[PDB]
Each structure stands twice: as C-alpha cells, then as structure tokens.
Design an enzyme around this catalytic site. Structure first.
Site, PDB file in Angstrom:
ATOM      1  N   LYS A 280      45.454  69.604  69.329  1.00 55.89           N
ATOM      2  CA  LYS A 280      44.529  68.120  69.247  1.00 55.89           C
ATOM      3  C   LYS A 280      43.018  69.197  68.742  1.00 55.89           C
ATOM      4  CE  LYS A 280      41.720  64.410  70.604  1.00 55.89           C
ATOM      5  NZ  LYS A 280      42.317  63.234  72.043  1.00 55.89           N
TER       6      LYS A 280
ATOM      7  N   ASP B 159      32.070  60.355  77.302  1.00 49.93           N
ATOM      8  CA  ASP B 159      33.724  60.729  77.392  1.00 49.93           C
ATOM      9  C   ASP B 159      33.873  62.403  77.168  1.00 49.93           C
ATOM     10  OD1 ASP B 159      36.190  61.477  77.338  1.00 49.93           O
ATOM     11  OD2 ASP B 159      36.523  60.149  75.602  1.00 49.93           O
TER      12      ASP B 159
ATOM     13  N   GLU C 175      39.102  56.350  72.018  1.00 52.56           N
ATOM     14  CA  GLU C 175      38.834  56.238  74.082  1.00 52.56           C
ATOM     15  C   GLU C 175      37.326  56.110  74.743  1.00 52.56           C
ATOM     16  OE1 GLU C 175      39.283  61.082  74.626  1.00 52.56           O
ATOM     17  OE2 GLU C 175      40.447  60.712  72.642  1.00 52.56           O
TER      18      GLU C 175
ATOM     19  N   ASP D 209      47.057  57.411  75.567  1.00 54.85           N
ATOM     20  CA  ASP D 209      45.980  58.492  75.956  1.00 54.85           C
ATOM     21  C   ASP D 209      46.937  60.017  75.884  1.00 54.85           C
ATOM     22  OD1 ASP D 209      43.639  59.913  75.903  1.00 54.85           O
ATOM     23  OD2 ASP D 209      43.638  60.086  77.568  1.00 54.85           O
TER      24      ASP D 209
END
Ligand SMILES: Nc1ncnc2c1ncn2[C@@H]1O[C@H](COP(=O)(O)O)[C@@H](O)[C@H]1O
Ligand SMILES: [Mg+2]
Length: 606
Positions: free
Chosen positions: A73, A201, A178, A11
C-alpha cells in the site's frame, strides 16, 4: 438488474486487512482460517512455488525475506520517481524495480522464474485472501465488494486500489474513505442529535483526519486532511535505525547487509512497540541474531517516544487543518473517534486529548476493526436486501485540482473539501491539439502540485462558418476518481468522448491478463483447500475410530478376536500410511477413506 450477491466490506490496510458483512441487522467481522479477525497484508512464494497470503506469509518472513512482500500500500498507484517510494524501498527486503515509470515488485516464484508484479497485483492477492475468508464464512462465492482507501489517497492511488479489486475478481461497487467508514461504525447505532465527529485514523502506513456532521443516518465530511506515508511502520523503522546503530557501536558489526538479521529485529521491534502501549519498558531478544551472537536490549516508552517525537507531533497539523477548513473550533467537536491500530500508542492519545483540552475519546470502538465495520454497513446498503437503516453519505475530494493548458490559462478547478460527485467544464476555442495537465494539491501555483495526469484532445475537425468549441468536463465520481471527457459544442452532436490519461494507467487489456494470472493461482488455492479438506476428513474418521474401537463397553465389547484384529489393524494401517503420505493427491485420500470403509462396514453392520 444485476444480482450482486452478498457484498462484503474490506478494509485493505498497510499491515492488516479486515473483512466484514452486514447480515440480519448487524455486522459480522469475519475470522480467517486461523481464527483471526484481522489478516496480515502479506504475500510470499515458498521455494517450491506455493503462494502464501496472510498469516502463513508473515510467519515465514525471517526464513524467506526476499520473496515475502508486505507494505504494498506504500507503493500502490505511485510512480518510480515519487520521493516516498525512493525512501521506502531502501527499507523493504524484497526487490522493487522500475517498470512503466512505476515501482514493480520482483520476486522468485518457483521453477527458477523471477516475476515482476504491479503493486495492484500484490494488493489483489491480499483482497483474494480476504474474499476467500468471507466465502468460507458465507458458504458461497463473493463477486462484489466495498474496499477502503485513505481519505488522503490521490487519484492514481484510488484507481490502483479499485484495479486491485478487479484483479482479485471483485466488482468494487464503492471505494470508501477510511475515516468515513469509521464514522459509520461510530454513528450507525446512535439514537441522538446532530453531532460533530472528528475521526483520527492512524494505521500501519497512513494517517487521516476527517471532520463529519452526523444526523439520523446522514454522514457528511466537512473537511479532510492527512498524510499517506505516516503510520506504524514508520515508528518501527525509527526504532530499527536506533538498534542497528546501537548494535554497530556495541559490537562493531553493521547488520544491514543481512536481511535475515534485520527482519528478526523488525519482528521483535514490532512486538516491543505494542508492549510499550501497556508497559513502560520492553525487552528485545534474538537468539543467534548475527554471526552466532545474541541480541538483547531493552526499549523504554520514553525512548520510543523520543525516537518518534517529530512524527507523533506532526499528527496535530492535520487536526488543525480540518478545524480551519471546517470553520469550527475545538469546543464544537462532540466526539473524538480514534481508529487504526497505532491510536493505541499512549503518546498519541495524550497529544489528541491535550489538543482537545482533556476530552475523552469515544469508547468501545475497536481501532483495528472500525473501518471494516463501516465498509460492511455501506456494502449492506448497496446489496439492497439488508436491515441497515437509512444511510446517506456525502464525502469530499481531498486535494484541490487544477489544470495547466499548454498555450492557455493555468487555473484552479475544484477546491479541496468539495462534495463529490462534482464537475467543472472548460471551453477550448484553440483547435489543433490541446494538451491539459491536471495537478493535485494546495500550492498556489497549480503546476507546483502533484501531477495527476496529461490529457490530449487530438481530433478537432474544421467548422466552416462556426467557432472551434470543444467543452472538456472534469468529473470526480462517487469513488473520488477523476474522469475527463470532451464534447464538440459547435456541431450539435452530443458525443461525450472519454480522454485517456497519458500517465500509463492499466488498460482493460492489461488488467484482464493480470486477472488471468490471479485466476491461475486461485485455481491452485482451490485444489489445495480441496486436498487438505479430504486428508483432514480421512484423518478425523481414523482417529475417531480409535475412540470407538477404544470404547470397550459399546462397539469394542461387540467385536470378536478375529474382527478387532481386522479393525484395530486397518485403523493403525491407515494412520501409518497417513503419516508418510501428507503430500498425496486428492485421489489417494479418497481411496484410503473408502478402503478403511469397505473393511469397517461389513464388520459394523453384523
Ligand atoms: N498495541 C499497539 N501499540 C502500538 N501500535 C499498534 C498496537 N497494535 C497495533 N498497532 C499498530 O497498528 C498498525 C495496524 O493497524 P490496523 O491495520 O488498524 O490494525 C500496525 O502499524 C501496528 O503496529
Ligand atoms: Mg494496517
């Protein structure tokens, strides 16, 4: 066939990353060298030119805020002009500059050198650290991985994440969405019927909602939707703005000009936010915050909520989109699965529970680790040799793809929520040059959406008696990534040429130079671990000999007056030397271990 070794699930998160492996029927979430099951997604270069990754990088942020990199990111696979980039870089302490129409990170790397890194290179460093963590646990090299991306990542963000893997020396066997990973973690164990799962999420930087059907190891995403610039970091920035304004009003001082002050505030704002998930007020205190003066303020949960009210509310819109696109209603949802660290926020849990008319979320799911857990399961499966169960994933593309053909039709090509892999072909009978633009998004005019890329078909030779008939194929692969190919249908020849995206993706040549640069730093990481590991050995020997010479009954009672003076001394002599030579090379520590051996051995064998 290829020996893929032990495939790890990583992850790769905005603020934290987490690595897992499936072995002996279960998942191990692997602790780093500081004992933490999650690792900050941070890199830094010390003034001496050392690369830190993870905890060590985060820990020296306030002291070195321009040469510490985080939240990569939020930049990866984006263009310079992307309004999200232009917003974000205003709040990032490191310099971000335009290179190859993209946001590069510019930092000082030691030896007077300034280097510009692609975001893929920063993310590669984070993946290296995760890989290093897994290797230490497994006691062997790791070459292959499953790496996560947000479900709502676009094509470029997807590819850039895979590229980051390659740069880190990992064959990314699979990019996994994810919320899909999270669903595997919820659903793996379950000896139950077909269930409709909604995964919510909300992480450090991104938000995704996915609706899945799960039935005896078969996981199908029915619909996804999210926002790739909404997460925990956003909530912090909202609180930061509040306190910068409060401090200015209270003192007259605008602290924005001072990176060190701003990063100290941000550090304490982050802690306070976390505290507000279990308490109703938190104190934010910074000794000599600015020009010698103390910062001391309280933040209430109410105030935290008010500052972020629009952001928290906006998370309901994706939930409504996935329910609509799935053609389901609220009562059709069997479980609500909360993942990502921000789902800890009480107002978020309340909005979700209220939206679902009082339904409790699924219990026992660690929101920081569920995604890695699922990734590790898929990686276990791709390994071949694991006790995983049967696992069948059907995932979807997040964005409608459409094409604009210059001098041709503009047309929708592949709707959002189409199961991948999938493809669609178009015949072009124009000949000459054909330029095709591909767009991603749901606006009804195709070209009002996000430009994925521009593709030129250049070489179409003459066909005396036949029709110019080029067939272009648009394929989304199991990684969610588009490949555009072209084949001449009028000839008979079956030459499926790959057309390259003119929106400057990293070429294999460029990637390999980044690999070589990463490998140079990995070499240093190797030396350092080796050097420290021996210094530790020498220091452990020595201090354990202090509690054997200091064993007056056993070994102590043996030694004479002449022997123990040529022993207690040799031990202290070595500790003394150790205390002034922490920086000494891997040679010297071996010597002194051996010097302390050749002086101890003759004595202890009498
Ligand atoms: N207790 C908490 N309350 C609010 N946000 C949190 C909490 N714990 C972690 N987070 C946020 O979760 C994000 C990290 O998510 P993850 O990478 O899933 O661990 C960061 O933005 C954190 O601030
Ligand atoms: Mg994160």
């Amino acid at each position: 066939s290829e020996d893929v070794g032990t495939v790890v699930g990583i992850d790769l998160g905005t603020t934290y990353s987490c690595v897992g492996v499936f072995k002996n029927g279960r998942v191990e979430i692997i602790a780093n060298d500081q004992g933490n099951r999650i690792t900050p997604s941070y890199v830094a270069f010390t003034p001496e030119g050392e690369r830190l990754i993870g905890d060590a990088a985060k820990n020296q942020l306030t002291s070195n805020p321009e040469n510490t990199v985080f939240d990569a990111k939020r930049l990866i696979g984006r263009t310079w002009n992307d309004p999200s980039v232009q917003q974000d870089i205003k709040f990032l302490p490191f310099k971000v500059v335009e290179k190859k129409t993209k946001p590069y990170i510019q930092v000082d790397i030691g030896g007077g050198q300034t280097k510009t890194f692609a975001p893929e290179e920063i993310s590669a460093m984070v993946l290296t650290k995760m890989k290093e963590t897994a290797e230490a646990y497994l006691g062997k090299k790791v070459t292959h991985a499953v790496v996560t991306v947000p479900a709502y990542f676009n094509d470029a963000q997807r590819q850039a994440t895979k590229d980051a893997g390659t740069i880190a020396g990992l064959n990314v066997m699979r990019i996994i969405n994810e919320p899909t990973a999270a669903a595997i973690a919820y659903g793996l164990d379950k000896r139950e019927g077909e269930k409709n799962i909604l995964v919510f999420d909300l992480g450090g930087g991104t938000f995704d909602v996915s609706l899945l059907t799960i039935d005896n190891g078969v996981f199908e995403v029915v619909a996804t939707n999210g926002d790739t610039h909404l997460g925990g970091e956003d909530f912090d920035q909202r609180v930061m703005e509040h306190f910068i304004k409060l401090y200015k009003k209270k003192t007259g001082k605008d602290v924005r000009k001072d990176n060190r002050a701003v990063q100290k505030l941000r550090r304490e704002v982050e802690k306070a936010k976390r505290a507000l998930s279990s308490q109703h007020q938190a104190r934010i205190e910074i000794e000599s915050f600015y020009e010698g003066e103390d910062f001391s303020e309280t933040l209430t949960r109410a105030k935290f909520e008010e500052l972020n009210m629009d952001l928290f509310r906006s998370t309901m819109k994706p939930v409504q989109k996935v329910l609509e696109d799935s053609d389901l209603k609220k009562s059709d949802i069997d479980e609500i699965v909360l993942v990502g660290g921000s789902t800890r926020i009480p107002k978020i849990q309340q909005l979700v529970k209220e939206f679902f008319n009082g339904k409790e979320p699924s219990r026992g799911i660690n929101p920081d680790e569920a995604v890695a857990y699922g990734a590790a399961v898929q990686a276990g499966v791709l390994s071949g040799d694991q006790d995983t169960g049967d696992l069948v994933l059907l995932d979807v593309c997040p964005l409608t793809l459409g094409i604009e053909t210059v001098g041709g039709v503009m047309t929708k090509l592949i709707p959002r929520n189409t199961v991948v892999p999938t493809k669609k072909s178009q015949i072009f009978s124009v000949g000459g040059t054909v330029t095709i633009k591909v767009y991603e998004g749901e606006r009804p005019l195709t070209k009002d959406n996000h430009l994925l890329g521009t593709f030129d078909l250049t070489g179409i030779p003459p066909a005396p008696r036949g029709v110019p008939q080029i067939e272009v194929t648009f394929e989304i692969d199991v990684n969610g990534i588009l490949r555009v190919t072209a084949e001449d249908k009028g000839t008979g020849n079956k030459n499926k040429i790959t057309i390259t995206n003119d929106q400057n993706r990293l070429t294999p040549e460029e990637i390999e130079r980044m690999v070589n640069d990463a490998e140079k730093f990995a070499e240093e990481d190797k030396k350092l671990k080796e050097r420290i590991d021996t210094r530790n050995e020498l220091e452990s020997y020595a201090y354990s000999l202090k509690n054997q010479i200091g064993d007056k009954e056993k070994l102590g009672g043996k030694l004479s007056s002449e022997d123990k003076e040529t022993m207690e001394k040799a031990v202290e002599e070595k500790i003394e030397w150790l205390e002034s030579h922490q920086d000494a090379d891997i040679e010297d520590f071996k010597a002194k271990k051996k010097e302390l051996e050749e002086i101890v051995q003759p004595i202890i064998s009498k």
